[PDB]
Structure formats: C-alpha cells, structure tokens
C-alpha cells in the first residue's frame, strides 16, 4: 500500500499549483510501483477541479475501451487458476479486488497492469494539461452590460472556492471587488467613500443600466458639449 | 482504521482555517472511535504550524506523566495473557502495537484507551487555541529603523509559507510589499513609478538610514523652516 | 551498481542549476532501480549547499521514524533466514550492508526498499524546493549603515564559493563590488578614479559612518541650503 | 509491447515543443518498463530534427563502447542456455531479437538491460538539451550584404519544415518575409504597395547590392549634404 | 578501485580551472597507485574541452605505438600462465580486463603497467598545457565587418558552455554583449536606451554594413567637413 503522508503531499501539490506541464513528474515519482486500486484511490482524492476530472475519467474509459478492442476474451476451459487475462474493464480496477490485483502482480509472468494503468493516467493528465485554463479570483471582471448585483454574486460564488486563509479573503474582498468594476458603476461606487458596506454599495449602483440612469449620463454628456457649443455664441 | 479521505478533509480544515475555538468539534467528529495509533497518525500529518505542535506534544507528554504518576505498575505473577494495564507511555501509542491496541479495545472490560488519548488531545488543542496568534502575510510591516533589504527578505521568507495559488502570490507581491513600507522609504520608492522591479527598488532605498540620507532629510526640514523664518525678514 | 559518469552528470546538474521545481525528474531518471546504499552515496556526493542538506536529512529521518511507528518489529522464532522485515533505521541504509540489501531486493517477494527510499527522498527534495531561496554573488549589497570593510569581507567570503572560472571572478570583483556600494561611500569611492586597488579604496571609505564624516556631510547640506537662504538677502 | 496511442502522444509532445529541460520526465514516464527494442522504436519515430539525432545516436554508441570496455566477454564452455551476458552492442538492441530480449528480462536474476538503455538515452537527451538551440521561422533575417533572391529562397526553404496548418503559413508568408528585410531593400520593397506578388517584388529588389544601385544611393546622400552645404552660400 | 568522491573532486578541479602548468601535481596525487583501467575511466569522465582531448588521446596512442616498436612480441611455447608481457595496445587498457590487469600488478615481478600509463598521460597533459589557450565568454568580440546577428549567435553559442549559475548568466548577457560590440553598431545600439530587448536591438543594427547605412555615415562625415569648409567662405 501507500503511506498516508505521501497521498497528502501529492494532493497538496495538486491543489497548491495551477494546471502546469510538470505535474506528471511528481505524479509518476510519488505513485511508484503502486497498485491500480491505490492509483484510483489517489485519483478520486483530488478536491475540487471536478471539471477536468470529467475529461480525465473520459480518456481513461476510452483507453479501456481500446484495450478491450485489442485483446480477446477467449480463454478456457482450464480449471480455475490464474482465471483470465486482465480486462480493460478491470485494469482500471472497477470490477476487481485487491486480492485479484495481487494475484496478477506477484504471479509469473508479472503482467504489470498497474504500470499500464499508470501509462493511461499519464496520457490523460497530459491531455488535461493541454485542454485546461486555470481560473482565479483575479480574472473575475464585470461585463460591460451586467447587473452589478449579479456581478457581486458571481464574485463571492467563485471566491468561496479560493484556497486561502481567512484574513486574506477579507482584504481580497475589500480591494479587488470594487477595483474591478466597470467605469460606469465605478464612477459612482468610488465617489461614495470606501467606508460603506456591500449593502450601501449595492443600493448605490442598483440604478445603473436603467433608463433613468442612461438619461442622466446622456444629458451630462450633451450639456458638456453645448457648454462650448455656446462659449462662441 | 480510518479512510484516507477523512484524514484529507480534516487536514484541509486545519490548514484552511486559522487557530479558532471551533476546531475541537470537527476534530472529535471526524476522529470518532478511532484507535490511538490512528490519532497520532492524524496528528503528525498536519503540515506547517510546527510551532504550536511543540506545545501540543508537550501537553500530551505532561498528561502522560501524570497518568503514570496516578497508576501503579504493580502486576503479576499471572502467566502472560492481557499482560499489563496500559501505561501513560503507551496510551499515547509510543511503545505499543496496533495488535496490542486491539487486544486492549476489544477485550472485556473495554478500557477505552483511545477515548482517554482523545480527551488529552482535546485538552491540548484547547490550550493551544488559547496560547496562539495566527500570523499572516498581511501583518508583516517594516520596522521604523530597519534595513529595507532585510524587510523584503522577511517578506518573501514568510510569503513562501502562505497557502495560496500562483497568481494570487504575484499580485500580492506587487501590492502589499510596497504599500506597507515606512514613510521614509515609501516617499522615495513611490516617487519612482510602479514599473521598476525589485532590483531597482532595492538599489533606490539602499541609502535610507545612512548618514548621507539623514543629512539630506534634516537639511530639507531646516530649509523649509528658514524659508519662512525669512519671509518676514 | 551505478556508473561513475552518471553520478558525475547528475551532480553536474545539481551544482550547475539553482533550486528549481524540475530537479526531481532528472533525479528519478538517473537514479533508476538503484540500491539504497547507492542512493545515499548519490546524496552525500553533493558539494556545498549543506544548508538545505540539513533539512533534507531531517525529512528523511522523520519519514524513517514514521515508518518505524507504523511497522512492528515482532518476528520469530524462525531460524535465521530472511531474518527480519526492513526497518526505518536500515531502509535508509544506516545499519545494513549491500549484501543484506541484495538479500532484500532479489528475494521473493521483492520488497522494493530502494523504491521506498526513493519516494522519501523525492518528498524531501520537493519540500526543499519549496523552502529554499538561491543566493548569488549578484545580490550581495551594502547595508545602509555598515562598515565598508565588513562589506568587502562578506563580498569575498561568499565570492569564494561562487562556481566559475578564474578570469570571470577577476572582472566580477572589478565591476560589481564598487557598483553595489551605498551612495555615501560610492560618491567618494567613485571620485577616486578606477585605477586604485582595494587597499587604497579601503583607506578611502574608512571614514564613512564616523562623526567627522557625518559632520562634513551635514555641513555641506546646510551650506547648500544657506547659499540661497541668502541669494535673496 | 507499447500501445500505439502512447507513442503518438509522446511524439506529439516532441514535435510540439522546442528543446527544453523537461522532456526527460515525460519520456521516462511514457517509456515505462518497456523493452529496449521498443525504446529504439520510440527513438527513430521522431520526425525531423535529425541534426540532434546525430549527437544522440553518438552518445548512445559511446556509452555502448564504454560498457563493452568495462565488461569482459569471457564465458563458457557451458552448453547453450542463457548463452552469454548482454553486450554493449546488443543492449542497444542492434544484434539481438525480441525473443532474446525477453529471455533476458524474465530470467532470474532479471538483468534490467532495458533500464540501462533507458539510463543511457536519458543521459543523451540531457546532453542534447544542453547542446541545442531551436530554430524558428521567426529568426530568419536578411544578412546585411545578401542577394534578396537567396534570402527568399532560404525563407521558404526553412518555412516548408514549419509545423503549422495551411492558412497560418499563408499569412506568415505575407507578413514576416517583407517585414524582416534589410532597410536597403525594405525602403524600395515597401514603397511599392503591398498588393504586388513575390515575382514583382523579386524584380524590384533585384538591383540592390549592384554598382548602379550603390551609385544611386551615394548620390542621394551627397546631394542631401550639398543642399545645405549651399543654403549658406 | 578509486572512491567516487576522489574522481568528483579531481574533475571539479579540472572544470573549475583553465589549462595551467600545475594540473599534473593534483592529477598524480589523486591518481595514486591506481589501475590503468581506472585511469582511463578518470580520463573520459572529463566534460567538455574535447578539443584538447583529441591531442591527448593522440599522444597516448603515439607512445603506445612507440612502446610497441621497442618491445618484441616473441613468446612461447610455454603453457598458458602469465601468458605474455603487456602490449602498447593493452597497457592503455584497450584490449585487457581488470582481471588481467591484476594478474599483472600483483604477480612477481610487479611490472608497473599502471605507472607507465601514468607516465604517458603526464607527458600528454604537459604537451596539452603547452599547446592550449583557454577560451572565455570575456574574449568574444565583434569582428570589424561582421553581421551583428551572427555576432549574437556566436555569443550565445559559446555562452551556453560557460560554467556558472543562472543569474550570473543573465547579468552577463545584459552587460558584456552590448558593451563589446563594434563602435559602428554601438553608436546606434547605445542611443536606443538600455530597456529594449534583444529583438528590438537586432532590428536596430540590422542595417549596419549595408549600402544605405554606409551612405548615411559617409554623408555625415562629409557634411561635418563641409560645415567648416564653408565657415570661411
């Protein structure tokens, strides 16, 4: 088996870092000579980022289907002993036991089912590294035509998944949320001093995008125009 | 035994949160009916914060000494079977095996050594909650008379332990480090636009605190005084 | 065993590069299927950087303690043959021989003690990669209030460990040492032309920081002030 | 054996990326426990970049020679069975069969010839990573004194090896080729609007470097001089 | 045999220092009483500087030929025992084994083949010390009529072999490359501030040496002449 601190360190590295091309080294290093059951154990222990786990699990099942497609199940009628060759269904450890897993790995010849599963998972992780883009708290920005309340609601929504301590989150919430708004709601949210709370702020920019507010802004632009349309009249 | 995802979730909660008075509930909940060996396993799996682990381990050994002090070791000469009562040395699982641990917990009467160890660890964690103060990246501030280079060196030194992703750290390094300096080095670091790197910044404030710089500042103050010492002359 | 050129190439890569997250790949690649004794051999062959070797050796001994804590030593009374299971003390190859090491690795089942030691060392190297910061000759800068002689003494002190050829070191000594001084000693060291030696330079800035020199500088600042304090009188 | 999709993914990574220090991880990961024949198979499947393949093949043969130099061929007269030890000639799989390869890898003790070949290939790939410099389409620039026609001929010559789709290549051919010419031919190629084809362009700059053209340019420079040599006369 | 740290220290001294007349002492000291096979082992472990290794290997083979020329191979028909005298072919350890090497060195009289090989290698190293000139990064200078791009290409080409750490190389690349150019390209590369990258620099001096640029420079010289050719007209 594998020691719990190894699994914790590996998962620490997976949370701690964004998708990057160097995950495979650390994975192959820590997951050394393990058994397939333990590898799937190591797989489902990842927390969050289930989006990519979708594609990963999919490339696994696809390789499983292809190994099935290459290998025939013809066997018998030998009396039960070393009962079949492995199957793309069980190489991933879905329908087989640790006992059966050992009876594969210590028997001669040692068919390295674990190694094959490792190879597949590496292929998958590579494809993932190519097909992902890490999301942060830093990128979340207000759309140009977007109700401010929904903006804050998405802000907190993704913020709750951010991996940091408490006080970081507080100061984060204080600096970026206001800083990253559109110019339209910023030029009103920032006139009101940075002492009010999210409630007063919400009630402040609640008018943006509406007809009364668009009127106001258009009138201010037109008045600034005509002020000099008439300096010379 | 305990399932690996339980240990990962508990440790996730311990890293993710600062010392707070509510850790004990979650700990007692997850660490339910476990065996002492597993509890110590759950203990040493914590990563970082070894400072408090010092005091924790100490309160454990102190309770162990006191349980020793209360319980006598007189026993025998019964032939080997259920060989002794437990000991403050082994209740913490230092000199006993999982086998011996079971031979304690399933035998009648079930002396709940695990429960006692749980009680001690709870006492300890409580004392820790009282005697700690969480450190952040947010608190690190420049001393009033402090070489700026050492300031940045401590900044990064504690920054490397911060528990967050990559791009957070980058923007962190860009905003707080400059913002949190003393007024003396700030009024020179901030005159130079926020486009230069840490090297140019370092070479800029390298003069602060020195005699040539103290001269400069004193002369500017005195000149501003005398400018009006003489407006009226 | 391992061939000497492999060890030389690996150590070449370790000296040649600063701490970086990609050391583990090359290490696991070169240190392939080796025996634990050879791995420790590969460990102590590193030259310099003993600071991190402290922490590395420590994480090894800690994993060793934990493997001890998990595995019981109960065994016997079988007559001597395959005499015990390995121990966290000897898995690192402290109290065991190459003979005993082989008698572990070629026997059935092959308990891959070497692989386990590899796993531990990888864990350690990773933790090192996180907890280090490479020092260079390039960073060494004069403190703001620092006797120039001690500055040069530290310069050479760390310079002697720099990994380069002779003439590089010479030109290094000529350009950075003077360039990286504080403005106070620079404005005197650089008035004296770049033809004098370290001795004349030392005798030149020997006055900085002292009361006579602070007087001089303060008087020059005050005189420049009063020159225009009186242009208008 | 190895599955074809693994080989395709590995070769995809090798084409897709320039020489970089992280190829070894992915290589060792995918090429796991394989047989030497398969490793050489994986070697010659690389497409293009044969230049470095020269040096790679050379470091392999050199290690082979050295292993020969260390290991004696004395053996016999045992009747044929496990017939010799391997040889630096056949460890690389030149003069041995897959059958003989298996008769090495499954026999006791399993002499890991494949692992040794892996070690050599890793050494080689590392040396390659050090001794290469990736060429692009982006670097190709006109020499200062260079017939424009040869410039375009080299442009296309290396362009045909670029690894991209069709329309990319078209727009590439339209923007960089003209942009990257020398000022001399650019100041004539760019006066003619960007609507003419490569033929008209070729006929345009065909005069550069020649005596008639050098005359023209020298006369224009001299005339611009004398225009003000005489403003004041 | 020889201990690996001895070989590493010797090779450290060989890389670390340029060709100098004092290598022989350290070599003879470390390579003490060794066996010829180990000496050749110590020879091919040198990394880089293969140029001189050519001449070295050549003087070895020449001494080997001469020892052949002096010593006759007549021997026999004694039954196999201490089978021949050594040969200039095998004294260098090309066609002999460590076993045969021992059967030479421990037999009476001990023909010190290793000592003779040592003598030859010393002769060779001496001749090398005379016939070499160390190349540095420091000497690389731009030819007077040389396309700047090729200049940078050679700069990096030899730079990649320099034996130093990362940040040294960076600052090296920043200071010497620009400093060491010809006056012609320097007076344009240095007018553009030291903030642009190698790409902008390349595009800047791409015009040098060409007819348009030679025109420009000649016109500026002639105009400066005529400015005073006419002050007095």
Report residue A56 as tokens: 């990963």
CA angle B201, B204, B206 (to 5 degrees): 105
Distance CA C153, CA E12 (A): 26
Half-sphere exposure of residue A126, counting CA atoms within 13 Å on the CB side? 24
Distance CA A107, CA A109 (A): 6
Distance CA A173, CA A158 (A): 12
- Which residue, chain included where needed, has tokens 């799937």? A40
D36 contacts: CB under 8 Å, gap ≥ 6: D91, D92, D93, D101, D113, D114, D117
Integer CA distances (angstroms), B95 to B65, B90, C68, C91, E143, in order: 15, 5, 11, 21, 76
A47 contacts: CB under 8 Å, gap ≥ 6: A11, A15, B8, B12
Integer CA distances (angstroms), E54 to D33, E59, E131, in order: 38, 9, 12
CA angle A223, A226, A229 (to 5 degrees): 165
Please tell me the total number of residues recorded for chain B in this structure.
233
Distance CA A181, CA C29 (A): 49
Please report the sign of the dihedral spanned by the C-alpha atoms of residue A56, residue A57, residue A62, residue A67.
Answer: positive
Distance CA D185, CA D206 (A): 9
Please name the helix (run of DSSP H) or strand (run of DSSP E) that holds residue A123, with its range, or none: helix A113-131
Which of E202, E210, E216 minimises the CB distance to D145? Answer: E210
- Which residue, chain included where needed, has tokens 């090297």? B199
Q: What are the helix (H) ranges across chain C?
A: 4-16, 23-30, 36-44, 50-70, 88-91, 98-105, 113-131, 148-159, 166-179, 183-189, 198-205, 211-229
Report the candidate in C71, C104, C75, C110 with the shortest Cα–Cα distance to residue C88: C71
Report the candidate in A155, A161, A138, A144 with the shortest Cα–Cα distance to residue A202: A155
- Which residue, chain included where needed, has tokens 């130099």? D69
Q: Which residues of chain D does E213 touch, with a Cβ-Cβ cutoff of 8 Å?
A: 183-184
Return the axis-axis angle of helices E113-131 and E98-105, rounded to nearest 10°. Answer: 110
Distance CA B8, CA A219 (A): 59
Q: Which residues of chain C does A32 touch, with a Cβ-Cβ cutoff of 8 Å?
A: 115, 118-119
Distance CA E126, CA C191 (A): 47
CA angle C163, C166, C169 (to 5 degrees): 70
Specify the 3-state DSSP secondary structure of B75.
coil
Contact B168 A138 (CB under 8 A): yes
Omega before E7 cis (within 30°)?
A: no
Distance CA E126, CA E130 (A): 6
- Which residue, chain included where needed, has tokens 């050992």? A102
A82 contacts: CB under 8 Å, gap ≥ 6: A103, A107
Distance CA A25, CA A3 (A): 19
Neighbours of chain C (3+ CB pairs under 8 A): A, B, D, E
Distance CA B102, CA B93 (A): 12
Q: Which of A168, A169, A172 to mutate to test the interface with B (most CBs of B within 10 A)?
A: A168
Report the candidate in E96, B18, B191 with the shortest Cα–Cα distance to residue A166: B18
Closest-CA distance of chain D to residue C189, Å: 41
CB E15 within 8 A of CB E48: yes
Integer CA distances (angstroms), E65 to D99, E58, E71, in order: 43, 11, 10
Q: Which residues of chain D does A28 touch, with a Cβ-Cβ cutoff of 8 Å?
A: 25, 28-29, 32
Report the candidate in A52, A46, A41, A44 with the shortest Cα–Cα distance to residue A13: A46
Distance CA E233, CA E223 (A): 15
Do D and A make contact via 3 or more CB pairs under 8 A? The reply is yes
Integer CA distances (angstroms), E75 to E65, E93, E110, in order: 19, 21, 19
Report the candidate in D171, D110, E205, C18 with the shortest Cα–Cα distance to residue A110: D110
Report residue D190 as tokens: 């760019």
CB A105 within 8 A of CB A35: yes
Give the 3-state secondary structure of chain D.
Answer: CCCHHHHHHHHHHHHHCCCCCCHHHHHHHHCCCCCHHHHHHHHHCCCCCHHHHHHHHHHHHHHHHHHHHHCCCCCCCCCCCCCCCCCHHHHCCCCCCHHHHHHHHCCCCCCCHHHHHHHHHHHHHHHHHHHCCCCCCCCCCCCCCCCHHHHHHHHHHHHCCCCCCHHHHHHHHHHHHHHCCCHHHHHHHCCCCCCCCHHHHHHHHCCCCCHHHHHHHHHHHHHHHHHHHCCCC
Q: Torsions phi, psi of E2, nearest 5?
A: -110, 150
Distance CA A149, CA A143 (A): 12
Q: Which residues of chain A does D3 touch, with a Cβ-Cβ cutoff of 8 Å?
A: 63, 66-67, 70, 119
Distance CA B139, CA C104 (A): 53
Distance CA C7, CA E5 (A): 10
Report residue E211 as tokens: 């007819």
Distance CA A192, CA D218 (A): 67
Resolution (A): 4.2
CB D121 within 8 A of CB D60: yes
D182 contacts: CB under 8 Å, gap ≥ 6: D142, D143, D144, D146, E206, E207, E210, E212
Integer CA distances (angstroms), D120 to B150, D7, D114, D123, E50, in order: 46, 20, 10, 5, 20
Report the candidate in C174, C139, C157, C151 with the shortest Cα–Cα distance to residue B202: C139
- Which residue, chain included where needed, has tokens 């020449």? E62
Please report the sign of the dihedral spanned by the C-alpha atoms of residue E139, residue E140, residue E141, residue E143.
Answer: positive
Report residue C196 as tokens: 């004098």
Report residue A186 as tokens: 């910023």
Report the candidate in B92, B34, B23, B96 with the shortest Cα–Cα distance to residue B62: B92
| Helices (runs of H) and strands (runs of E) counted in chain A | 12, 0
Q: Torsions phi, psi of E199, nearest 5?
A: -65, -50
- Which residue, chain included where needed, has tokens 């094959």? A116
Integer CA distances (angstroms), D219 to B49, B95, D208, E211, in order: 79, 99, 15, 12
Closest-CA distance of chain A to residue C58, Å: 16
DSSP 8-class letter at B82: S
Integer CA distances (angstroms), B102 to B64, B73, B75, B116, C69, in order: 20, 21, 21, 15, 16
B109 contacts: CB under 8 Å, gap ≥ 6: none
Omega before A163 cis (within 30°)?
A: no
Report residue C84 as tokens: 């015990």
B84 contacts: CB under 8 Å, gap ≥ 6: B73, B75
E47 contacts: CB under 8 Å, gap ≥ 6: C8, C9, C12, E11, E15
Specify the 3-state DSSP secondary structure of A226.
helix
Return the axis-axis angle of helices E4-16 and C4-16, rounded to nearest 10°. Answer: 50
Q: Is any Cβ of chain D less than 8 angstroms from the Cβ of C108?
A: no
Specify the 3-state DSSP secondary structure of E145.
coil
- Which residue, chain included where needed, has tokens 């480090």? B177
Distance CA B107, CA B118 (A): 19
Distance CA D62, CA D68 (A): 10
Composition of chain E by helix, strand, coil, percent to 5: 60, 0, 40
CB B100 within 8 A of CB B111: no
Buried b or exposed e, range B174-200, using 16+ CB within 10 angstroms = eebbeebbbebbeebbeeeeeeeeeee
Tell me whether residue D181 is exposed, middle or buried, using C-beta atoms within 10 angstroms of its C-beta: 0 to 12, 13 to 18, 19 or more: buried
DSSP 8-class letter at B163: -
Contacts of D31-36 with C-beta under 8 Å, sequence gap 24+, read: D31/D2, D31/D118, D32/A28, D32/A115, D32/A118, D32/A119, D33/A112, D33/A115, D33/D114, D34/D2, D34/D114, D35/D1, D35/D98, D35/D101, D35/D102, D35/D105, D35/D114, D36/D91, D36/D92, D36/D93, D36/D101, D36/D113, D36/D114, D36/D117
Distance CA B76, CA B83 (A): 9
Q: Is any Cβ of chain D less than 8 angstroms from the Cβ of C153?
A: no
Half-sphere exposure of residue A195, counting CA atoms within 13 Å on the CB side? 1
Integer CA distances (angstroms), A73 to A62, A106, E67, in order: 18, 22, 69
Tell me whether residue B173 is exposed, middle or buried, using C-beta atoms within 10 angstroms of its C-beta: 0 to 12, 13 to 18, 19 or more: middle
Q: Which residues of chain B does A171 touch, with a Cβ-Cβ cutoff of 8 Å?
A: 138
Instruction: Return residues 45-64 of C near A (CB < 8 Å).
Output: 63
Q: Which of A88, A119, A124 to mutate to test the interface with D (most CBs of D within 10 A)?
A: A119
CA angle B150, B156, B157 (to 5 degrees): 80
Distance CA A3, CA C88 (A): 13
Distance CA E183, CA E204 (A): 14
Q: Torsions phi, psi of C199, nearest 5?
A: -65, -50
Report residue E56 as tokens: 């070295």
Q: Torsions phi, psi of C98, nearest 5?
A: -60, -35
Rg of the Cα atoms in chain E: 29
CA C35 to chain centroid:
26
CB D117 within 8 A of CB D39: yes
Experiment used for this model: cryo-EM
Distance CA C37, CA C113 (A): 11
Q: Torsions phi, psi of E35, nearest 5?
A: -100, 155
Which of D28, D109, D126 minimises the CB distance to C9? Answer: D126
Distance CA C146, CA B147 (A): 10
Distance CA D73, CA E95 (A): 11
Buried b or exposed e, range A68-98, using 16+ CB within 10 angstroms = eeeeeeeeeeeeeeeeeebbbebbbbeebee
CB C102 within 8 A of CB C7: no
- Which residue, chain included where needed, has tokens 């990362």? E166
Contacts of C40-49 with C-beta under 8 Å, sequence gap 24+, read: C40/C92, C40/C93, C41/C2, C41/C7, C41/E4, C42/C2, C42/C7, C42/C10, C43/C121, C45/C7, C45/C11, C45/E4, C45/E5, C45/E8, C46/C11, C46/C14, C46/C15, C47/C11, C47/C15, C47/E8, C47/E12, C48/C15, C48/C161
Integer CA distances (angstroms), D135 to B173, D140, D155, D162, E148, in order: 36, 9, 12, 10, 18
B123 contacts: CB under 8 Å, gap ≥ 6: B59, B63
Closest-CA distance of chain C to residue D8, Å: 22
Q: Is any Cβ of chain C less than 8 angstroms from the Cβ of B192?
A: no
Please report the sign of the dihedral spanned by the C-alpha atoms of residue D90, residue D94, residue D96, residue D101.
Answer: positive
Rg of the Cα atoms in chain B: 29
CA angle B79, B85, B89 (to 5 degrees): 125
């Amino acid at each position: 088996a594998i020691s719990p601190r190894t699994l914790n360190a590996w998962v620490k590295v997976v949370e701690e870092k964004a998708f990057s091309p160097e995950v495979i080294p650390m994975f192959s290093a820590l997951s050394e000579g393990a058994t397939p059951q333990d590898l799937n154990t190591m797989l489902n222990t990842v927390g969050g980022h289930q989006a990519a786990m979708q594609m990963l699990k999919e490339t696994i099942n696809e390789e499983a289907a292809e190994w099935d497609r290459v290998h025939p199940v013809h066997a018998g009628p030998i009396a039960p002993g070393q009962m079949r060759e492995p199957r793309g269904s069980d190489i991933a450890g879905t329908t087989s036991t640790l006992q059966e897993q050992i009876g594969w790995m210590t028997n001669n010849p040692p068919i390295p089912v674990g190694e094959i599963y490792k190879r597949w998972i590496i292929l998958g992780l590579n494809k993932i590294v190519r097909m992902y883009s890490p999301t942060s708290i830093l990128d979340i920005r207000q759309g140009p035509k977007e109700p401010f309340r929904d903006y804050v609601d998405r802000f907190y929504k993704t913020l709750r998944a951010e991996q940091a301590s408490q006080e970081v989150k507080n100061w984060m919430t204080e600096t970026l949320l206001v800083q990253n708004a559109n110019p339209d709601c910023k030029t009103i949210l920032k006139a009101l001093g940075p002492a009010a709370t999210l409630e007063e702020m919400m009630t402040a920019c609640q008018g943006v995008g509406g007809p009364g507010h668009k009127a106001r802004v258009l009138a201010e632009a037109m008045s600034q125009v005509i002020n000099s349309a008439t300096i010379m009249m």
